Amino acid sequence: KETAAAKFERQHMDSSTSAASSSNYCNQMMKSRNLTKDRCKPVNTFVHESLADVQAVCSQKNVACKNGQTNCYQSYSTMSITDCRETGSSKYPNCAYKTTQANKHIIVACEGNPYVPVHFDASV
Numbered sequence: 001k002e003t004a005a006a007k008f009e010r011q012h013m014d015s016s017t018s019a020a021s022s023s024n025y026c027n028q029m030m031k032s033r034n035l036t037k038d039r040c041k042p043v044n045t046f047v048h049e050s051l052a053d054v055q056a057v058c059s060q061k062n063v064a065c066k067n068g069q070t071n072c073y074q075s076y077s078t079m080s081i082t083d084c085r086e087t088g089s090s091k092y093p094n095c096a097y098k099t100t101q102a103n104k105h106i107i108v109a110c111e112g113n114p115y116v117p118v119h120f121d122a123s124v
């Protein structure tokens, strides 16, 4: 089974690299993390930081989520991330992504006990 925390790890953590592996990083990762199985996900962010560093964000700056909920947290430091965004040709079942490397503050939604990230909200 997959807990909300483990889902977040599968969708959003890639600690094994400090930055996106190559041109095809996103196509490969969106496939291998099983994100595009029933539709193309329009955007998905992978975080190139330790799991402990990301979990630590739930203790940092409380901010409003994009949906207006109040269980979101912005990282004090910026973090190495890759945004995978669909290209114009992308169309289920043939999802295609552009890979954009960035260093931004991340915003996550935290839930549970222990209080851990369950959604990747935004970067800024």
Ligand SMILES: O=c1ccn([C@@H]2O[C@H](COP(=O)(O)O)[C@@H](O)[C@H]2O)c(=O)[nH]1
Residues within 6 Å of the ligand: 043, 044, 045, 046, 066, 119, 120, 121, 122, 123
């Ligand atoms: O910068 C972003 C924005 C959105 N998402 C993913 O897209 C979903 C919703 O995006 P949106 O509703 O903000 O378009 C989020 O739940 C998250 O999984 C990201 O990974 N990175």
